[PDB]
């Protein structure tokens, strides 16, 4: 992603941002973190979109302790609602992206790797759908699918 | 080396010269006036 | 007996009836971050915006306290919007299954505005989000309403 | 290193904007307001750009 | 009952029909009717364009003539498939695309007449393959304004029509208008017989004969080679020059290339000295 990030295309390069956020899901790789926050500050109002949303879906799964920039970029979704002069499309998915985070009260999280490795077939389809949601608004819906949850079930007896 | 004080005095007489609208009647008067104005 | 236990443990649906009881005890979510982007209003996509993200938030949940305290915003929402919106609250109450549908019987077209046909559209898209990811009667249900649905207005979230 | 030349080229799609009149100040009023006369014209009342 | 972000799709000959008649009408704003397609509310495809003749009254629906109208769609009818006119298409010199209180008289009309009573602003500003300064704009109603004027159900879209924005003339007539996004249609053979009558025809392609090539080469050749015999003096001076301070030295003279290229392709005419030819 880090090569196609920097491209002449506005789409190329959010779709970079919103190929990076999805490929490491809840987990993230430090270098992925760093690679978002250029994206963020990029010209184009459509790649600083699809930047704060990705970096919502890196967001779930972490805390300030685990990675340093999670307060910054929750600030940061803050600062571009509240600020007017941000444009209209650019916030769009930043309070989106608020939402992404706090999903299920920040308990539920992306992945589509099963521990035994098998693939999560209802988290794939979200997070394509979720790509075509920029194509399509109700389709953040289908993302809503794919948020495995991070506690664990210890029942003695089933009842 | 008084000089300083009387320094500060101008440079201060020079801050004091720099820092030297309705809610909706102005605003009115702002839309009705051109953005460019032509004084004849 | 064992027959009846085997056939319930392999269908899971208790175990994810059992994680909507985990969210619904356990939600960490805070309504001041949810107030405070409803305040910098748009009055456009951010209403759209606010909505699915109150619903990420509150999925499974059921608490639709962000929903509940504004009319007025909510209503300002377009014919469309609304209908992304109903779909939204399928999306929180998406964990009750079949206790859910009754609940969104409070929610149905008929109890709420037979106007709104978008409305009614996205109520059949909400019902869908609740049962997604399962195979029941309901979803035979679903296909039955779809027959006498409209072609169009209602089958564009049916 | 291919991105920055073409962006360059990119940045020259600046080149196509109009330019803007040359005037000269007569005087200054207060409300982001000054009195320029045009170079050619006459006297017009501006508004200030934030910068 | 709500607008969106709507595709309006030029086919090729209504695009090219729209330049070549307002560049001959430059002077007099000539206007035209578009023969457009309503195949959905979405999608908007003008498959042809026709030109109104000139008309003295002007770019106003006055100017337009009903009689004209149907007898040219009588002969549409007779040969190939008529379309109902979307709208009226016409060029203001002046102002690229800009909107006047006479073009919405007229395209109100438009309005009253169908629905969506697309209006084209095509003009003199050009370039070559690059330039589509045209633009189209549908007004939005005074009752409308109320309500939200364009509800959008899909972001990208909306996004693909943020990226035009607005013009800053534009700007200034813009309330009681709203900008609708212009796509070429799609243009399959189309396509192909321009890009066949491209690099072939358009471009210097004559084939059979397409590959001055021995005569004022050699001139050439040591004119380049003077240039840079007096450009390379630059890199000399940057590699003597302690340049412990980075400074400007007039570096990549190159023409290497050009170079490379003339005497390399002149050189390929070995190829029709013993191949093409015996
Ligand atoms: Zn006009």
């Given at each position: 992603v880090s090569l196609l990030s920097e491209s002449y295309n506005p789409h190329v390069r959010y779709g970079a941002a919103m190929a990076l956020g999805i490929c490491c899901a809840g987990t993230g790789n430090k270098e992925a973190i760093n690679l978002l926050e250029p994206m963020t500050n990029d010209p184009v109002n459509y790649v600083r979109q699809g930047a704060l949303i990705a970096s919502a879906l890196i967001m779930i799964q972490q805390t300030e302790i685990t990675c340093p920039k999670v307060n910054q970029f929750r600030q940061l979704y803050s600062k571009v609602i509240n600020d007017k002069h941000d444009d209209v499309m650019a916030k769009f998915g930043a309070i989106l992206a608020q939402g992404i985070l706090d999903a299920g009260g920040h308990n539920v999280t992306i992945s589509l790797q099963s521990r035994t490795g098998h693939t999560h077939m209802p988290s794939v389809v979200g997070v394509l759908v979720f790509t075509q949601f920029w194509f399509w608004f109700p389709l953040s819906h289908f993302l809503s699918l794919a948020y495995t949850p991070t506690c664990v079930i210890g029942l003695n007896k089933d009842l | 080396l008084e000089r300083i004080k009387d320094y500060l005095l101008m440079e201060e007489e020079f801050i004091r010269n720099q820092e030297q609208k309705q809610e909706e009647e102005r605003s009115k008067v702002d839309d009705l006036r051109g953005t460019p104005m032509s004084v004849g | 007996d064992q027959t009846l236990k085997m056939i319930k443990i392999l269908s899971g649906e208790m175990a994810i009836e059992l994680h909507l009881q985990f969210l619904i005890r356990n939600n960490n979510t805070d309504l001041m971050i949810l107030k405070n982007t409803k305040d910098?209003?748009?009055?456009?996509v951010c209403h759209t915006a606010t909505v699915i993200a109150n619903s990420f938030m509150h999925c499974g949940t059921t608490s639709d306290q962000f929903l509940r305290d504004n009319l007025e915003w909510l209503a300002r929402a377009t014919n469309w919007a609304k209908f992304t919106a109903t779909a939204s609250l399928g999306v929180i109450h998406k964990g009750h299954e079949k206790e859910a549908l009754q609940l969104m019987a409070t929610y149905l077209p008929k109890d709420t505005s037979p106007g709104s046909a978008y409305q009614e559209g996205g109520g059949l898209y909400a019902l869908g989000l609740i049962h997604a990811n399962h195979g029941g009667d309901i979803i035979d249900y679903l296909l039955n309403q779809l027959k006498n649905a409209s072609n169009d207005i209602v089958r564009h979230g049916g | 290193l291919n991105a920055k030349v073409r962006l360059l080229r990119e940045e020259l799609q600046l080149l196509q904007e109009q330019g803007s009149y040359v005037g000269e100040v007569v005087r200054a009023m207060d409300k982001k307001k000054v009195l320029v006369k045009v170079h050619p014209e006459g006297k017009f009342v501006v508004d200030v750009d934030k910068n | 009952a709500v607008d969106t972000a709507e595709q309006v799709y030029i086919s090729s000959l209504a695009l090219l029909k729209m330049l070549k008649h307002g560049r001959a009408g430059v002077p007099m704003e000539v206007m035209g009717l578009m023969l457009g397609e309503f195949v959905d509310d979405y999608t908007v495809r003008v498959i042809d364009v026709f030109a109104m003749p000139?008309?003295?009254?002007?770019?106003?629906?006055?100017?337009?003539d009903p009689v004209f109208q149907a007898k040219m769609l009588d002969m549409l009818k007779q040969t190939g498939r008529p379309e109902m006119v979307v709208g009226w298409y016409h060029s203001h010199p002046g102002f690229g695309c800009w909107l006047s209180g006479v073009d919405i008289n007229t395209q109100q009309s438009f309005e009253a007449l169908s629905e969506r009573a697309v209006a084209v602003v095509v003009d003199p500003?050009?370039?070559?393959?690059?330039?589509?300064?045209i633009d189209a704009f549908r007004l939005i109603n005074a009752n409308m304004?109320?309500?939200?004027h364009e509800p959008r159900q899909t972001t990208s879209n909306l996004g693909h029509l943020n990226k035009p924005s607005i013009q800053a003339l534009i700007h200034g007539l813009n309330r009681h208008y709203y900008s609708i996004t212009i796509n070429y249609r799609k243009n399959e053979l189309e396509q192909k017989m321009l890009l066949n009558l491209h690099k072939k025809s358009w471009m210097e392609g004559l084939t059979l004969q397409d590959y001055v090539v021995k005569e004022m080469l050699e001139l050439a050749k040591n004119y380049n080679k003077a240039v840079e015999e007096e450009d390379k003096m630059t890199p000399e001076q940057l590699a003597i020059k302690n340049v412990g301070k980075q400074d400007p030295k007039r570096h990549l003279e190159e023409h290497v290339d050009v170079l490379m290229t003339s005497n390399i392709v002149q050189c390929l005419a070995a190829m029709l000295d013993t191949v093409v030819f015996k």
């Open positions: - | - | 910098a209003v748009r009055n456009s | - | 000139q008309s003295g009254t002007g770019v106003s629906v006055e100017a337009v500003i050009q370039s070559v393959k690059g330039k589509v300064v304004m109320v309500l939200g």
